[PDB]
Write a protein that binds this ligand. Structure first.
Ligand SMILES: [Zn+2]
Lengths: 88, 24, 82, 101, 65, 149
RNA sequence: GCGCAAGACGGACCAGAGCGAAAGCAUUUGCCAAGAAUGUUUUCAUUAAUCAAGAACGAAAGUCGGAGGUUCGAAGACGAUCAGAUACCGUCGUAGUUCCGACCAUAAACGAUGCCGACCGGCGAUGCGGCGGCGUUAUUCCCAUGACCCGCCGGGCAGCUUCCGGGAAACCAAAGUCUUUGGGUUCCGGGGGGAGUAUGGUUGCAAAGCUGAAACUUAAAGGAAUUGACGGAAGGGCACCACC
RNA sequence: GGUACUGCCUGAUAGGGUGCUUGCGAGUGCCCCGGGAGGUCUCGUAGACCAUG
């Protein structure tokens, strides 16, 4: 934003995950869950926050797949939304 | 081939529909 | 296999078979007698109970309805009748 | 004469599936039929690993991996030899090939 | 080839036995249910038995995938 | 299986063999009858009543207790619906579908389902004209449908 | 690299998984009405199965009006390849692809297998609801509830297996219960061509749709499987009359 | 009192994640302190993918 005479003042803009990590997470036998919120902070800054989550395979699990029913997914989604909204 | 002689048949039929008009 | 008494099934198996496919049609549900701890009153309740049942004076909610069975509120005792 | 019991596609109990674009071809094929091959490899390949490993500013820097989902129309696969035809009885076996030693 | 007497020599080699049978043990461990099936046969009084604790988790199966 | 649907299934009630009113039940036939009477005076259909009594008062089948099924008892005392309650229900449902289908015309599926419902109505009503529970000039009409319910 | 705009499209997750009468149907959130399965000691008391006439929906393309035009793109125009390419390849690019409102009613609309019902071998899987059951977890004890885990029951999509029996065979737990021939019903085929053409009728703005012959012609046309021979298919294999 | 172990992170020596030793697969070891010496830990090993007749 401001230049100090060979000093550059930098303010936060954005954040993201490395493509590699993103792909590394996604797999074929699990439900993926996503949500987002638009929140104004206390200083007025307006942020779109994205959230990604996954059904985890249980430790003794025999069944090949871990899938969440739609209502469960909606629930989790709602709670993510709630949480990060409250945080920011 | 079938599709094409069906098509050709519709061409011919349109042409016959032209050559014989209800005016004749 | 090739030998079975369709006449004398073992009671266990008959507990296993679907209610209509039994040698005689036997309802799988029973009338139960519910008692809330804080009161004396006894209440007759159907095993799988739709709606919601109440103890009159205490306004006690006995049970919530669910898909299969009504589920009683905690601490409330019950006895199958006969 | 019916060739496959499943008709080459995974479609059961549903009427129509979303069509997808071939990786190699651009030839339209339904997702069920499409031969899918997932590819997990390293961005830089075999020798340039040991090569670049030395030119790093970081210590114990692990090379990123490239992940690519591939769809091939039935033709292209048999061309690239990703899939090859087999005997009448041996066809019946849907157990994937032993890349696991 | 089957040579002869080599069926008799195998009758020699194959014939063997340790001083006591491996079937002889002062304590054999058995599951509660085995003891039940024995109790049906009125053998629930056998001396050599030791009832061993049943394993609490049930996993007998391979994790399909 | 189902008349208007593809599915074929088993979900139902199996009445026990003994028609004999069990021991613990403490209510008379008359008692039950009064209970039913006031419950009908609260605006309930025979099914509703049956359910209430089955749940709270431990009546397995009213029919075993009083010797008469519910609708006959009610119709005997003079309080009965003008049209049998199921026919009523179907009419009301069709009412709803109509009402929703006027705002959204692009809905194909609902139109389809409406037509199905109307068929069920016509079957039933035919059956009731033949059993003389309706005057046989009776006609279900799209316009006065909102009235009857 | 920073921003802006427009219209399309919802990747991966996505499966021999789900939902729908079938076409078909995947971003979030709410609103609106449906629906199967399940549960039920609720209610009506035969109201039911299949369907000429008649009606509802019906992919894509296509046609009329309107809006909109990013991508792709028939027509067209070039550039190439080619003996020749008005074709496969490539650059450009109209109608159309998109939304709204009226038509059209046809697909290899395919499980190439009408619908209702009864019976007939197993076996693991899965989806949905229910029932029961040690034990783990959501931190340490009590009940709920959820996640795994072990079964049972009823619907579903499927799978594997088998001298159930079929079948011309491929194959099929239905295509089984067929000369030991009869559970109910609708549609429908009669060698191949001629031809789904001619005509009349009928629907449509149009393209067409539905109904639909004959004269003549012809010993086969066809279906499964079997050995061959071939392939510009995939594999191996050999030879200094193949090479290194 | 007897008797075991003990990488890091979270939330217990439990539960849940995640590691290093040789590229891989085994072994082995990795809480704290003091002191002591002995040192290129051992055994295996495909890890190979850029027209006309
Ligand atoms: Zn291709």
């Amino acid at each position: 934003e401001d230049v100090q005479g060979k000093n550059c003042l930098t303010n936060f803009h954005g954040m993201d995950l490395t493509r590699d990590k993103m792909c590394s997470m996604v797999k074929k036998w699990q439900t993926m869950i996503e949500a987002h919120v638009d929140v104004k902070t206390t200083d007025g800054y307006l942020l779109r926050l994205f959230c990604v989550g996954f059904t985890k395979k249980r430790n003794n699990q025999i069944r090949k797949t871990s899938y969440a029913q739609h209502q469960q997914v909606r629930q989790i989604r709602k709670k993510m939304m709630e949480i990060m909204t409250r945080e920011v | 081939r079938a599709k094409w002689r069906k098509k050709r048949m519709r061409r011919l039929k349109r042409k016959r529909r032209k050559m014989r008009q209800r005016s004749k | 296999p090739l030998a079975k008494d369709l006449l004398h099934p073992s009671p266990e198996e008959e507990k296993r078979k679907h209610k209509k496919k039994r040698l005689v049609q036997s309802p799988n549900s029973y009338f139960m007698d519910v008692k809330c701890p804080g009161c004396y009153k006894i209440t007759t309740v159907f095993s799988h109970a739709q709606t919601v049942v109440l103890c009159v004076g205490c306004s006690t909610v006995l049970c919530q309805p669910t898909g299969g069975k009504a589920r009683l509120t905690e601490g409330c005792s019950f006895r199958r009748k006969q | 004469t019916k060739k496959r019991r499943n008709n080459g596609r995974a479609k059961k109990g549903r009427g129509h599936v979303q069509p997808i674009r071939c990786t190699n071809c651009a030839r339209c094929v339904p997702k069920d039929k499409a031969i899918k091959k997932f590819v997990i490899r390293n961005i830089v390949e075999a020798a340039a690993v040991r090569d670049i490993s030395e030119a790093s500013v970081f210590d114990a820097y692990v090379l990123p991996k490239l992940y690519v989902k591939l769809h091939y129309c039935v033709s292209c696969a048999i061309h690239s030899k990703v899939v090859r035809n087999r005997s009448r009885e041996a066809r019946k076996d849907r157990t994937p090939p032993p890349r696991f030693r | 080839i089957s040579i002869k007497l080599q069926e008799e020599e195998r009758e020699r080699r194959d014939n063997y036995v340790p001083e006591v049978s491996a079937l002889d043990q002062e304590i054999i461990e058995v599951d509660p249910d085995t003891k039940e099936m024995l109790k049906l046969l009125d053998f629930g009084s056998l001396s050599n038995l030791q009832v061993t604790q049943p394993t609490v988790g049930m996993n007998f199966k391979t994790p399909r995938g | 299986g189902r008349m208007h649907a593809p599915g074929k299934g088993l979900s139902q009630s199996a009445l026990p063999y003994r028609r004999s009113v069990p021991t613990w039940l403490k209510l008379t036939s008359d008692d039950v009858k009064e209970q039913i009477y006031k419950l009908a005076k609260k605006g309930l259909t025979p099914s509703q009543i049956g359910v209430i009594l089955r749940d709270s008062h431990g009546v397995a089948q009213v029919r075993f207790v009083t010797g008469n099924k519910i609708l006959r008892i009610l119709k005997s005392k003079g309080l009965a619906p003008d049209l049998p309650e199921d026919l009523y229900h179907l009419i009301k449902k069709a009412v709803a579908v109509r009402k929703h289908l006027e705002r959204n015309r692009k809905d194909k599926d609902a139109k389809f389902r409406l037509i199905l419902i109307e068929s069920r109505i016509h079957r039933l009503a035919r059956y009731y004209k033949t059993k003389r529970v309706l005057p046989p000039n009776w006609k279900y009409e799209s316009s006065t449908a909102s009235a009857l319910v």
